[PDB]
Amino acid sequence: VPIQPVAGAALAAPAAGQINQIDPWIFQNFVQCPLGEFSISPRNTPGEILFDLALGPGLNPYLAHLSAMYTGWVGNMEVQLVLAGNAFTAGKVVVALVPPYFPKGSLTTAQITCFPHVMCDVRTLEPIQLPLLDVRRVLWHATQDQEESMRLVCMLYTPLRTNSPGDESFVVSGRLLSKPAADFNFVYLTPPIERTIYRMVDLPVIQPRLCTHARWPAPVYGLLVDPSLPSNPQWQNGRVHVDGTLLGTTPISGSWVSCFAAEAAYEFQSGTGEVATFTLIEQDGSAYVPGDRAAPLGYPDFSGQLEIEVQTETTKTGDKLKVTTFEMILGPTTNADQAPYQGRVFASVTAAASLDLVDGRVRAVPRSIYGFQDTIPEYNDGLLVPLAPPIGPFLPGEVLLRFRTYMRQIDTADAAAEAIDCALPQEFVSWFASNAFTVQSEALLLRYRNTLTGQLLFECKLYNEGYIALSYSGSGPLTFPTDGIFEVVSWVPRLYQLASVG
Amino acid sequence: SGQDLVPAAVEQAVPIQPVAGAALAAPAAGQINQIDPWIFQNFVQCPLGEFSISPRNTPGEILFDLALGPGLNPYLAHLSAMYTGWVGNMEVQLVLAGNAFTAGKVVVALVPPYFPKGSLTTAQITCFPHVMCDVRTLEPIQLPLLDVRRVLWHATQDQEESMRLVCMLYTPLRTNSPGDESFVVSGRLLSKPAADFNFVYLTPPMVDLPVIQPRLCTHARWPAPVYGLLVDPSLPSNPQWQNGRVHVDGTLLGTTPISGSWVSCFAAEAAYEFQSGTGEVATFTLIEQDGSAYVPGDRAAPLGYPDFSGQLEIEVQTETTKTGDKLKVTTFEMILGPTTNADQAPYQGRVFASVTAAASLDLVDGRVRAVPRSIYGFQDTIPEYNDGLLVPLAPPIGPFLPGEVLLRFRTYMRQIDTADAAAEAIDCALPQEFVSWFASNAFTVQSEALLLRYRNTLTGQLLFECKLYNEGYIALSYSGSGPLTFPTDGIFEVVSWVPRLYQLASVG
Amino acid sequence: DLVPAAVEQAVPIQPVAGAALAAPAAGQINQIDPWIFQNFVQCPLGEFSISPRNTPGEILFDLALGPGLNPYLAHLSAMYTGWVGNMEVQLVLAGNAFTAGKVVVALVPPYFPKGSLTTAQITCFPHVMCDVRTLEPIQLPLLDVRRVLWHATQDQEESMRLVCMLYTPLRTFVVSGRLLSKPAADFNFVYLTPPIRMVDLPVIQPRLCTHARWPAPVYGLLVDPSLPSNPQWQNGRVHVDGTLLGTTPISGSWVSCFAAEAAYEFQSGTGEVATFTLIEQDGSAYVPGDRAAPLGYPDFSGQLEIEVQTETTKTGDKLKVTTFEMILGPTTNADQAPYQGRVFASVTAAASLDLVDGRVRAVPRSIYGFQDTIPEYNDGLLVPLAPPIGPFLPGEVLLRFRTYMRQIDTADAAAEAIDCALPQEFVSWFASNAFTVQSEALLLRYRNTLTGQLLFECKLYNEGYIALSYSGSGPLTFPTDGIFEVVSWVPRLYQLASVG
């Protein structure tokens, strides 16, 4: 390739306090890059980027671990592209050396050859060994942020011309392997901050039968997919990102789920009963402001007639403090002018006279539901508010995993419980919030495996928007046992195809 | 490397003398100009440099024709805007590493300047300094392209006469592989300057598409947002549409407008008369919409007139002489074609419209501009242009290779209809933004097709490739019978210059 | 010895290494054509002007070192990721014998706290005193004082800045100054890349345009000081790098239209009333955010007649187009809320039309009582709006683009002429090309295409409007067959020539 040599530690060593050698056995092994893997299919149009990997310590896991106890790094790497095709195949890839400070996205096929590049046939026997050099403007790179280093881009240059038997299409699968060059080292030995460097995402070791549902204060009963249900719900509770961004009205605590905290003004109306006007606050004691979310944190994101329980203090003799059940319609179209986005809602109970209740602070918890509807409630009296987006999109053949619990239902005819679903339990929401991981791809590959048997029940994908997708082409609902553990394998791209279940 | 049952290299014994490059030009150049050494160190591919060989190519078909120049190299084609001159030899490698199960030969020849440039035949191709390559050849085929000229240098802004590197299919591409498709060779052209290429004289200093999603566009045959992106095999292949027909270099066709609010509209001088039994009839003496008048020229109507048929309703700004009302907007019904009894003639610049009225509306005659309202009995055919007679018109959208279909950009019209509830799906070849883009930029054509590719850039899924010919229509390779749709969240990009013989990947 | 009382001005320098510092970590060092070092070529920012309106202390120009000062370097830099090394800048001033004035050209270093620069401080840098009466150009070096090895091209970080300011007031007329620039003998680029942009315009006559605030061809091209100079126009606003301000759409058919879900009901005394729940016009859905309305909503007041595709269940008719009346602003009584996504319209009908509720897209038909002011957005409440157009230098007025609207009017025969800042074509061009905005204004020249009659120079500011230096108070119309073409980037204190 037409590129000069790059001085690594030689240019760093005067303005660096220490120049820190790594184990010579790490220079002796090619380790797989965590995302550098592709499969060329014959249906791939040329121009498709196969991978795009930046130079850094995150290419190697041993360098990614070592870099926590260092201030800086500098140097070059060696890289191997491995292609698993045979003879009888015919296609080309081009691996380019993109510099730093070059734009990203949308690079055509003529442009990839205007770089330093190699062009290699899928029939290549040996790996293609590549230099990934540290073309930099600084004297060394600081380990705890990621600036512009050289990328390594591979895109399909010439399509694949194979025979492909009828049962299964042929693919040329490529892997990318790497090790540091002889000129790679670290800079200044610091205390090993474990918190955030390149720490792989890990989930809590908790069974889903022990979890807590995130849209209703009840334990999780079911773990299942159902394509008959709407695969893009616009839910507002139990919405978290992976890197720790709470979406919508998602609370931290499981106690705040489907509850609200307010100041109640109690007034009697004849023919209706005791109507309480609730001025909403945040449930930790601070006030609520109409802002970037639909409601105060923990407000219910469903419709129907909810019975709430409020701690009522009365002025009547013979009683001081009690727990009173009110009724409150939620949505989607109500006549009581429910505006939780403004922080002012209304509830009522059928009372023959004035209950003589002291106007004051309450935290209403839900008691039961009448007429459950899996839709958004009325936040601004018919006017639509800023909402968290619907859950999706999916690759075709991938369905949304659902955590199911059952609600207390007022029902005069049927006894079948209202099964309400969320996308993630509250333990995973609080885990993602309290960890605040660094995200380096667009999907996490998860394995659900039973503990005592070791039986890998399914592999599944976790997206960064906070929802788990399975590869399931079946139409009926399939339940899964809630005794296993979700474990993280790796970062995988969003276009990654799974293995089907059922 | 995983087989040696293909040919490895070729011979390069081309019968030619070595040609001086920049060193002849240097005493008459007036400057010292250099290209940096790293451009000399790297075979890069120009966006002209893609071609394909199919089993449907007969021999004698030109796979490529590369006139020597700075435009065979993206580096050199970018540098060439800063200079008046160039000289020097190019070197070009041909990458056609066909599959093991294929057979065929190409002859790449060195055609001198001043040779009549079409049609070379298989008799003639070998009567030049040629080299005969196998399509299975594994390592690239490196070729000189020498600067045989009788001048000292070439002007860059003149497409002068230079040596052409010409490749035709010399033996047809066949395949002895057991029963499946037959393979298709995707060959690439790479080039760098040779050791003595140079430019001449520093001078004051390209094809693309706008970054617009197809849902963000303006439909060119009806004033509406584009709603659909689909081929449709049930529709005919060669419509003779007038609106939205623009070329790559910007040459408008027929009644093709530029402004987006000119579509399906017409400005004219309305003479208003009341007729008993019909109502209010306006005779429209047609003008142009920018304030000027209409002249019957190389088109059949004013710019922006509809190219469909039916009963169109129009909004006209009518001044009335009655009391209690001075200005209003009146709807006129107007049957269009192809054969009506109202003598509709936009070619002469005089049409007629009418509305049912029990009394005279007393409308002031004068300049109006009718915008469309609704359709009754929509027809995607040509209207009555010259009282049924012949007018000069745009050619139909074509020709296609067998297997290439027109990609239709769909929007939905407003319709008055007494029996059917479905809106009218009207299609165009290109939206108004691409028409304004081509009319504004005035691009330059290297070959008769632009291989384009459509990316959803937020998801990365490259959906297809497609060929934009220089007449301004986009074709895909599609074999299904049902209309297959594609999402309107994506981005088209220019990928390459290809001829008409490019083998597209079939979708659907 | 004799100290000479006349010493020719020369900036003393210490030499800066370019490629010698960069080369072991720049991946390749790229030599440029040796004749680029030979000729001073004009900066595409390099036009300024001094006037007696300027006060001593005004920054006349303010250049940054880099490849975008020489057009050969700015053109070559499209194929490189980086650059390094020194330049050389000439100044050309065009005064006559009876203008007095000194300007100072200083070499301000990077990471200087670049806020204020009074007149005493400007001589504490390496500088040169220039007289406004000099016949001959003035040469400066411009060195790559930096703390990095090389420079990203695509990312203007701090390099050495070249500031010029009025030292002594211009006393006595506008004095023109030009900047010319070449690379000095040490300049390379770094790392040849594919070429992935100097500001050019769409060659469209102003009569060939689509008006950005009403779906009509643009008829007029005029100034009018009688109108309010700083309107709060929400459509047709675009930044030069492509940032849309207000509710500015991309598609020309989106203008003054809306796409919604119509719910049809009948009311006695009013007629047929439709509730329109607004969405995005490209097929997607609308969410209230940091803009006042969905893309393409009518930003004017009055009574707009709309046309909706109505499906009816009556006999003898299935589909038709029905014209509704829809009040817009400024204060209405029909609960117009485009910001939250639900508006209302009505038509006078004696009986129920029995219309099917569903998705419609209403185009405008006519206006009754047109006003050029803002409508009612959130039932009179404050919404995120585009800022008012400005500011204006003393002596300029806003240029306005006129079209004529369809109007139902009972007494007046004059059609309502609506003005916009820029048409839709400039919006689509600027929003799809996404230029690097390299200074604060763009100098334009409205020149006739065929004959060559140049009418007026005008300043395209970055905020998406055109201001002309105009000393009168009345209107003035221009012929609409000319093409604006870009001369240079120009600073904000640039003084035009007065028209009219």
Numbering used by the authors:
A (entry chain C): 30 to 531
B (entry chain B): 17 to 221, 229 to 531
C (entry chain A): 20 to 191, 199 to 222, 228 to 531
Question: Which of the paper's sentences describe this entry?
Answer:
As members of the Caliciviridae family, norovirus virions consist of an approximately 7.5-kb positive-sense single-stranded RNA genome linked at its 5′ end to a viral protein (VPg). This genomic RNA is enclosed within a nonenveloped, T = 3 capsid approximately 40 nm in diameter. The capsid is formed from 90 dimers of the major structural protein, VP1, in one of three quasiequivalent conformational states: A-type VP1 proteins make up the icosahedral 5-fold axes and form AB dimers with B-type VP1 proteins, whereas C-type VP1 proteins form CC dimers at 2-fold axes. Each VP1 monomer comprises an N-terminal region, a shell (S) domain, and a protruding (P) domain (subdivided into proximal [P1] and distal [P2] subdomains). P domains extend outward from this shell and mediate interactions with receptor molecules and cofactors such as bile salts.
We used cryo-electron microscopy (cryo-EM) to determine the structure of wtMNV at 3.1-Å resolution. wtMNV was cultivated in RAW264.7 cells, then purified by ultracentrifugation through a sucrose cushion and 2 sucrose gradients before being applied to lacey carbon grids and vitrified. The P domains from AB-type dimers (surrounding the icosahedral 5-fold axes) are rotated approximately 100° clockwise relative to their position in the published structure, whilst the P domains from CC-type dimers (at icosahedral 2-fold axes) are rotated approximately 75° anticlockwise. The P domains are also located much closer to the shell of S domains (separated by approximately 6 Å rather than approximately 16 Å). Interestingly, the positioning and orientation of the P domains in our map of apo MNV are closer (although not identical) to recent structures of bile-complexed MNV, despite the lack of bile salts. The quality of the data allowed us to build a hybrid atomic model for VP1. The resolution in the S domain was sufficient to allow confident building of most residues up to the flexible linker region. As expected, the flexible linker connecting the S and P domains was not resolved for A- or B-type VP1. However, the flexible linker for C-type VP1 was resolved, suggesting it is less mobile than the A- or B-type conformer, which correlates with the improved resolution of C-type P domains. Most of the C-type VP1 N-terminal region is disordered (residues 1–29), whereas A- and B-type VP1 N-terminal regions are better resolved (missing residues 1–19 and 1–16, respectively) and have distinct conformations. Using focussed 3D classification, we identified a remarkable diversity in P domain dimer positioning that was not coordinated over the capsid surface and was not equal between different quasiconformers, with CC-type dimers being less mobile than AB-type dimers.
